[PDB]
mmCIF file of C-alpha atoms in Angstrom:
data_model
loop_
_atom_site.group_PDB
_atom_site.id
_atom_site.type_symbol
_atom_site.label_atom_id
_atom_site.label_comp_id
_atom_site.label_asym_id
_atom_site.label_seq_id
_atom_site.Cartn_x
_atom_site.Cartn_y
_atom_site.Cartn_z
ATOM 1 C CA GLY A 1 8.393 7.681 48.661
ATOM 2 C CA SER A 2 5.059 5.775 47.573
ATOM 3 C CA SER A 3 4.700 2.236 47.408
ATOM 4 C CA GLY A 4 5.004 1.748 43.530
ATOM 5 C CA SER A 5 3.338 -1.250 42.428
ATOM 6 C CA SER A 6 0.469 -2.767 43.931
ATOM 7 C CA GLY A 7 0.288 -5.789 42.286
ATOM 8 C CA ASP A 8 -2.944 -6.760 40.211
ATOM 9 C CA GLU A 9 -4.417 -6.402 36.245
ATOM 10 C CA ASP A 10 -7.072 -4.420 35.834
ATOM 11 C CA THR A 11 -7.321 -4.818 31.885
ATOM 12 C CA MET A 12 -5.700 -8.341 31.246
ATOM 13 C CA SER A 13 -6.513 -7.356 27.171
ATOM 14 C CA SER A 14 -5.161 -4.308 26.624
ATOM 15 C CA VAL A 15 -5.390 -3.105 22.908
ATOM 16 C CA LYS A 16 -4.205 0.058 21.458
ATOM 17 C CA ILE A 17 -4.673 0.698 17.730
ATOM 18 C CA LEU A 18 -6.040 4.516 15.167
ATOM 19 C CA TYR A 19 -7.164 4.411 12.201
ATOM 20 C CA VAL A 20 -6.598 7.166 9.676
ATOM 21 C CA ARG A 21 -9.257 7.914 6.851
ATOM 22 C CA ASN A 22 -9.450 10.917 4.097
ATOM 23 C CA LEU A 23 -5.314 10.440 3.643
ATOM 24 C CA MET A 24 -4.087 12.552 1.141
ATOM 25 C CA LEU A 25 -2.111 10.409 -1.604
ATOM 26 C CA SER A 26 0.137 12.740 -1.679
ATOM 27 C CA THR A 27 1.068 12.545 2.486
ATOM 28 C CA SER A 28 3.967 10.697 3.001
ATOM 29 C CA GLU A 29 3.999 8.058 5.922
ATOM 30 C CA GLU A 30 6.716 10.065 7.820
ATOM 31 C CA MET A 31 4.121 13.198 7.679
ATOM 32 C CA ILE A 32 2.100 10.835 9.918
ATOM 33 C CA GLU A 33 4.601 9.547 11.626
ATOM 34 C CA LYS A 34 5.626 12.986 12.481
ATOM 35 C CA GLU A 35 2.168 13.960 13.247
ATOM 36 C CA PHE A 36 1.627 11.034 14.981
ATOM 37 C CA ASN A 37 4.627 11.523 17.227
ATOM 38 C CA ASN A 38 4.256 15.548 18.033
ATOM 39 C CA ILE A 39 2.369 13.944 20.841
ATOM 40 C CA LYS A 40 4.974 11.870 22.670
ATOM 41 C CA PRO A 41 8.799 10.890 21.408
ATOM 42 C CA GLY A 42 8.955 7.430 20.309
ATOM 43 C CA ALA A 43 5.223 6.584 21.101
ATOM 44 C CA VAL A 44 4.257 5.658 17.520
ATOM 45 C CA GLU A 45 5.078 1.715 17.378
ATOM 46 C CA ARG A 46 4.454 1.278 13.657
ATOM 47 C CA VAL A 47 2.497 3.514 10.662
ATOM 48 C CA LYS A 48 0.818 1.599 8.111
ATOM 49 C CA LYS A 49 -0.120 4.353 5.410
ATOM 50 C CA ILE A 50 -2.866 2.871 2.676
ATOM 51 C CA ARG A 51 -4.322 4.197 -0.864
ATOM 52 C CA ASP A 52 -6.537 6.707 0.904
ATOM 53 C CA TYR A 53 -5.996 5.512 5.125
ATOM 54 C CA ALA A 54 -3.328 3.869 7.016
ATOM 55 C CA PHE A 55 -3.213 2.545 10.947
ATOM 56 C CA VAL A 56 -0.762 3.843 13.844
ATOM 57 C CA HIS A 57 0.129 1.335 16.865
ATOM 58 C CA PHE A 58 1.547 2.469 20.507
ATOM 59 C CA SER A 59 2.675 0.662 23.007
ATOM 60 C CA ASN A 60 0.085 2.101 25.702
ATOM 61 C CA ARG A 61 -3.792 2.621 25.570
ATOM 62 C CA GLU A 62 -2.735 5.746 27.243
ATOM 63 C CA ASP A 63 -0.613 7.163 24.443
ATOM 64 C CA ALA A 64 -3.244 6.465 21.803
ATOM 65 C CA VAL A 65 -5.815 7.936 23.823
ATOM 66 C CA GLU A 66 -4.079 10.836 23.543
ATOM 67 C CA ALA A 67 -2.965 11.257 20.311
ATOM 68 C CA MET A 68 -6.599 10.001 19.095
ATOM 69 C CA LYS A 69 -8.378 13.058 20.403
ATOM 70 C CA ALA A 70 -5.297 15.873 19.958
ATOM 71 C CA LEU A 71 -5.739 15.067 16.255
ATOM 72 C CA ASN A 72 -9.533 13.980 16.188
ATOM 73 C CA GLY A 73 -10.512 16.635 14.004
ATOM 74 C CA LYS A 74 -7.478 17.936 12.160
ATOM 75 C CA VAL A 75 -6.704 19.529 8.709
ATOM 76 C CA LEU A 76 -3.182 17.541 6.954
ATOM 77 C CA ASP A 77 -2.025 18.567 4.053
ATOM 78 C CA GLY A 78 -5.096 20.262 3.677
ATOM 79 C CA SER A 79 -7.767 17.596 4.220
ATOM 80 C CA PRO A 80 -9.868 16.707 7.195
ATOM 81 C CA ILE A 81 -7.978 13.691 8.678
ATOM 82 C CA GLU A 82 -9.938 11.625 11.498
ATOM 83 C CA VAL A 83 -8.151 9.136 13.965
ATOM 84 C CA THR A 84 -10.396 6.137 15.856
ATOM 85 C CA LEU A 85 -9.795 3.366 17.839
ATOM 86 C CA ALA A 86 -9.893 0.469 14.708
ATOM 87 C CA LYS A 87 -11.422 -3.443 15.981
ATOM 88 C CA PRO A 88 -9.552 -5.862 15.124
ATOM 89 C CA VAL A 89 -11.235 -9.004 14.511
ATOM 90 C CA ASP A 90 -10.344 -11.825 16.664
ATOM 91 C CA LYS A 91 -11.153 -15.123 18.578
ATOM 92 C CA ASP A 92 -10.456 -16.509 22.575
ATOM 93 C CA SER A 93 -7.078 -18.248 22.064
ATOM 94 C CA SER A 94 -7.945 -22.342 23.219
ATOM 95 C CA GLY A 95 -5.548 -23.745 25.212
ATOM 96 C CA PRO A 96 -5.056 -25.517 28.799
ATOM 97 C CA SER A 97 -7.639 -24.752 31.317
ATOM 98 C CA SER A 98 -5.785 -25.898 34.261
ATOM 99 C CA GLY A 99 -2.372 -24.789 33.336
#
């Protein structure tokens, strides 16, 4: 078999988020979870519905990316829904340099 693991860190800051806009008030979370889940089973971390928007989290960026495009350009409940990578605000945490 193949080695398996090389042992290293490509991306220290791995963030996966999918923001949705133009969501029909009639549409429910289940619809958002199922639609996004259709891509991968047990992939959607959580689904937060909002007035006319919502956010979808994932376990790995890879999955989030797939579900992003796959849906990117879809019409749910008769409405053009969009999916992009949300950019959450944050600041480099301060800690002990030598630890």
